[PDB]
């Protein structure tokens, strides 16, 4: 009940989805929106390069006083980061989507990532202890990621 | 209510904005006023800063308490390889300003000149000035050279030439740049027909620093200040530091303004960029235009001091190396660190005061070490204090053993 969009040709498109990821929403937002037009192998290349800290993830919406870096001129930004926990959870999802392409009978080297959508999951409640006897919230904010990818060849 | 006591305000307010220089090099924002009764001559020259030292000279100043007595003056050494002319621009007066008519080029440009057009020269096609080189000697391009040379003679009031520092004769290991520094030098003197003939004659020919300046004159030094990062208000503006028992801090300006005008003013001192600023610094008296070591093995030798020694100190200029080329030696300091390109420009101040007409003869140039305390003037003097040491008596033992 979850996919906002459906593929054109569903017999040439493999889906993948995360139930409740427990990464930060505001970092898996930009980790995942950067691969929304990329092929599967160029999107996987980007994530192995964010881990090596050779390329960065551009923070374009939930940036808000992050440090500005020299590597965000690739994306036309000034500030971006290397969110390694949102990166490696998106690598588990690209590996699920290409396993779901092989059992459909499809070549995973021809898959363009159509449709990345990240939405907010239900938050999880903890507690921090402030001065003067106060107790105030310490929420988690996890996320929902979904993607298909449609084959574009010849 | 008025301020209870008066001090003069902190910092000159005319050097605002105290932001980083747009470019690392010294650039003249104004050349001297063109006297058309003079002979055509260049007006600026780029030199690179190579440490500093001090001299001894006797003073001709009648009336003074130091008349015919020897002073010690600090001097700065500025290495000057010759610059090669590659272009001629010409500017025409408009009610908007001063518009460029065009530029002729030299028919032969250096590798390090057309290196300035590349962020990456070695990994490139390197084909800049390659279609201008071949069009310039076609039939139509020899016309178009003479077409815009005539348009200088019609419309131009200001003729300038384009030179570049020629860094491969600067055999310096620490100035790491290999592309040449490019500026425009204004011709002053004569009419426009007499300026272009001097601009045509020294084209694709190197101009040497002693053809622009004389030995005992002054000059302006357009140069970019040594940079110091973000500094607070006490380092940058020189405000007074607050009493010791102040909460949240000392090195601050206490009041940044009244209730009304309900805004902070541009006159209130704040923190930010200190250093790396362009400065012009007029009336820098020149003391010695030096000559290259291939010509002069005895550079710091005076009439009154016959020690055979060069300008480079013992153990080199600290952080720089060796002065391998021609050099100018100026009285005092110039803005900037060592290795930085600086523009010696002819003065706009009246050079008629009796301090500035004074001819300079030296008596001593300090060639002692700038590492540590300088003690010996040459290495011949350290081999006479210290005799044969241990490492010399075992090198003399290998030389007998052969």
């Amino acid at each position: 009940t979850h996919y906002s969009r459906k593929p054109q040709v569903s017999s040439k498109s493999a889906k993948a989805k995360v139930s409740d990821l427990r990464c930060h929403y505001k970092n898996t937002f930009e980790t995942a929106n950067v691969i929304n037009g990329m092929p599967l192998r160029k999107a996987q290349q980007l994530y192995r390069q964010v881990l090596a800290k050779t390329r960065c993830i551009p923070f374009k919406r939930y940036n808000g006083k992050i440090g500005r870096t020299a590597q965000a001129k690739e994306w036309g930004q000034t500030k971006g980061r290397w969110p390694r926990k949102s990166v490696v959870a998106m690598m588990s999802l690209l590996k699920n989507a290409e396993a779901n392409a092989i059992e459909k009978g499809l070549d995973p080297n021809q898959m363009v990532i159509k449709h990345v959508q990240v939405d907010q999951a239900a938050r999880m409640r903890r507690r921090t202890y402030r001065a003067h006897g106060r107790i105030t919230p310490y929420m988690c904010s996890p996320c929902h990621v979904q993607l298909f990818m449609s084959e574009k060849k010849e | 209510s008025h301020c209870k006591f008066e001090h003069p305000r902190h910092g000159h307010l005319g050097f605002l904005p105290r932001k980083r220089s747009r470019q690392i090099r010294g650039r003249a924002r104004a050349f001297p006023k063109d006297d058309a009764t003079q002979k055509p001559h260049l007006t600026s020259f780029m030199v690179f800063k190579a440490g500093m030292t001090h001299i001894v000279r006797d003073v001709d100043r009648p009336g003074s308490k130091v008349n015919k007595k020897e002073v010690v003056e600090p001097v700065t050494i500025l290495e000057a390889p010759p610059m090669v002319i590659v272009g001629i621009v010409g500017y025409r007066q408009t009610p908007v300003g001063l518009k460029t008519i065009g530029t002729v080029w030299a028919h032969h440009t250096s590798v390090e000149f057309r290196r300035r057009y590349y962020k990456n020269w070695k990994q490139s096609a390197q084909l800049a000035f390659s279609r201008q080189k071949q069009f310039a000697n076609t039939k139509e391009g020899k016309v178009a050279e003479a077409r815009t040379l005539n348009a200088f003679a019609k419309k131009a009031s200001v003729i300038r030439v384009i030179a570049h520092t020629q860094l491969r004769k600067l055999r310096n290991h620490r100035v790491g740049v290999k592309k040449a520094h490019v500026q425009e030098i204004q011709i002053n003197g004569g009419n426009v027909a007499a300026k272009i003939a001097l601009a045509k004659s020294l084209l694709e020919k190197e101009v040497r620093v002693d053809s622009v300046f004389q030995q005992s004159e002054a000059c302006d030094v357009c140069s970019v200040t040594k940079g110091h990062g973000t500094e607070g208000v006490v380092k940058r503006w020189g405000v007074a530091c607050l009493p010791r028992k102040t909460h949240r801090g000392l090195r601050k300006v206490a009041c940044i303004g009244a209730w009304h005008p309900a805004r902070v003013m541009y006159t209130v001192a704040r923190a930010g960029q200190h250093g790396y600023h362009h400065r012009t610094q007029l009336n820098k008296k020149i003391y010695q235009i030096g000559r290259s070591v291939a010509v002069e093995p005895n550079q710091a030798t005076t009439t009154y001091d016959l020690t055979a020694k060069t300008i480079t100190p013992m153990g080199g200029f600290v952080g720089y190396g060796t002065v391998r080329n021609d050099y100018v030696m100026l009285k005092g300091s110039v803005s900037g660190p060592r290795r930085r390109v600086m523009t010696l420009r002819r003065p706009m101040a009246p050079q008629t005061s009796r301090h500035l007409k004074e001819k300079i003869v030296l008596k001593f140039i300090d060639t002692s070490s700038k590492i540590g305390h300088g003690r010996f003037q040459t290495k011949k003097e350290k081999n006479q204090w210290f005799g044969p040491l241990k490492k010399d008596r075992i090198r003399r033992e290998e030389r007998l053993r052969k």
């Binding site: - | 007066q93 009610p95 005008p261 805004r263 902070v264 541009y266």
Partner: protein
Amino acid sequence: AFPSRKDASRAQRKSAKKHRPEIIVIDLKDHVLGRAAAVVAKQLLLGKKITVVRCEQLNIAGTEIRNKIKYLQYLRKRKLTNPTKGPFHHRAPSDVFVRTVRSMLPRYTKRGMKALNSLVAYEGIPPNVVRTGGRVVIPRAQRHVCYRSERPYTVLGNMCKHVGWKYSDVVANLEKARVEKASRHHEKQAKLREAWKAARKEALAKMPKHNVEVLKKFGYA
């Protein structure tokens, strides 16, 4: 503003003839500064494209010392907190006139910005304006009908050179060189101007006489 390659290829795909819009060029020698500015501020706002020329020759009534002080009282104004955000004090006669027009426009709407960018306001007569048609004049603002001739007046090029405006002598050598050039062009064609009028007197009696006493009834002989 030179036209881009998108604006240049479309003038080659479509074979665009060289176009000039209907531009009225006023010669403002010996005009009242604010009477000419109000005629111009109404015409620009009625959709006229207006080039204004010779702004160093505009006149303001009163002693030159009087009008120079009124500019220096205007230059006394600046935003004390940050003068880079302050009133910007333009010293050119061509820019004094653009301001005086602009202060008579609805400056803070788009209709008054479309009318202030319809004004150009050169000073002297530039080479692109010279041979583009006869200059016009504003005869209700011309100082010989608007100022009493015993009263002093003030040339705007002289008030402005002593408050700034470092290009007074440049304009004076660009307009000395024009009137020398345009008077050499006018001694030429004097045997072309006299050639036509000795052919328009010769066209009479070579044309039929029943079209001449209708050409003499309406006084066109």
